[PDB]
């Protein structure tokens, strides 16, 4: 599923991402935009053999288990396939655990490069929430 910007903003608000761990809603919408372009089925194979999964490109070496990554730690205690659903529940649950680490949203490279430091609020502006 490819989410509309406002559609994802509303969904993420329902999923309690607004202000979670001190991060405003705009951060999450912006992250999804640059990490997966709002595509829930997005996947990207990495050099270390790991794969980034879903709307928030969650990595198989640290967060989810896809059964095909070397030093997989499965910190989110969940199969990577669950993060490929049109239902964002699992991706949000895991993203909350990820962001709860001291590194915060820096875990998302696209977010760091295209969102951090910008007017993230603009991503939820002009939406029926």
């Amino acid at each position, epitope marked *: 599923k490819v989410f509309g910007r406002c559609e994802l903003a509303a969904a993420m*608000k329902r999923h*309690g991402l607004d202000n979670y761990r001190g991060y405003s809603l705009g951060n999450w919408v912006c992250a999804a935009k640059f990490e997966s372009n709002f595509n829930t089925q997005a996947t990207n194979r990495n050099t270390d053999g790991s794969t980034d999964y879903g709307i928030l490109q969650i990595n198989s070496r640290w967060w989810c288990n896809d059964g095909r990554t070397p030093g997989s730690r499965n910190l989110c205690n969940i199969p990577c396939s669950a993060l490929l659903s049109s239902d964002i529940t699992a991706s949000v649950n895991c993203a909350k655990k990820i962001v709860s*680490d001291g590194n915060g949203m820096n875990a998302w490279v696209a977010w760091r490069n295209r969102c951090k430091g910008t007017d993230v609020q603009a991503w939820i502006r002009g939406c029926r929430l």
Partner: antibody
Framework: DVQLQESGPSLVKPSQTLSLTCSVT????????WSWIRKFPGNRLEYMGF???????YYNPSLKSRISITRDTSKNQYYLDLNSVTTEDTATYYC???????WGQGTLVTVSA | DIVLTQSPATLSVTPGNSVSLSCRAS??????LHWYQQKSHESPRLLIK???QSISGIPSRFSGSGSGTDFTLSINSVETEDFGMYFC?????????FGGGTKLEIK
């Protein structure tokens, strides 16, 4: 599967450091976030803090910096150090993973002269 | 700190009947409210996570509802194994906090 178990003294004196150990069996401590929670005599629960995979910690401000949470991979255990305890620290201490699906059995620690 | 207020403090019920327990937050916490059950000589047991998400291994009779500041835990047809303490906990902001708890007992 995963098992957690608390161990340490059940009786401590005021002003001393209370130290508890949580042994994890079934998987590496490097594969989860680890927490410490306690229940006071009044059926009041307090989330003490947790340590995440990177080593970053979160401590409850209520503890006034008296708490320390550390880990030891080689022994697959994590710890709780609470300094300068008072009778106010008498409680049942529990270790659990951050998700809340794995809990220890809890251990009562009494602070008394 | 976010304050969680639970009510009623105590609730008596006859097995077979249903009940609902309330938890109100001092400020909005989205869906970041979890429910725990706790019996004497036992550690807490997670029943519902993130306001309404079910947990594998928990009886289906338990369900959670709510968002923002008002939440409820419902038990459809209480069983004797359900008597004990119930606590809500929020993870929206550190420090995570717990409600004062609601005691469920046989009437």
């Amino acid at each position: 599967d995963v098992q957690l178990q608390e161990s340490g003294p059940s009786l401590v004196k005021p002003s001393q450091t209370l130290s508890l150990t949580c042994s994890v069996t079934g998987d590496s401590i490097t594969s989860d976030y680890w927490s410490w929670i306690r229940k006071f005599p009044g059926n009041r629960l307090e989330y003490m803090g947790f340590v995440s995979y990177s080593g970053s910690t979160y401590y409850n401000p209520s503890l006034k910096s008296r708490i320390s949470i550390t880990r030891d991979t080689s022994k697959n255990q994590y710890y709780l150090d609470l300094n300068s305890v008072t009778t106010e620290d008498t409680a049942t201490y529990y270790c659990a993973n951050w998700d809340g699906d794995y809990w220890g059995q809890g251990t009562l620690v009494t602070v008394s002269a | 700190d976010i304050v969680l207020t639970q009510s009623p403090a105590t609730l008596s019920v006859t097995p077979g009947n249903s009940v609902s327990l309330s938890c109100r937050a001092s400020q909005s916490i989205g869906n970041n409210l979890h429910w725990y059950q706790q019996k004497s000589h036992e550690s807490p047991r997670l029943l519902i996570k993130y306001a309404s998400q079910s947990i594998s291994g928990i009886p289906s009779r338990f369900s959670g509802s709510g968002s923002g500041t008002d939440f409820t835990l419902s038990i459809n047809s209480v069983e004797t194994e359900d008597f004990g303490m119930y606590f809500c906990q929020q993870s929206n902001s550190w420090p995570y906090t717990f409600g004062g708890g609601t005691k469920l007992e046989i009437k």
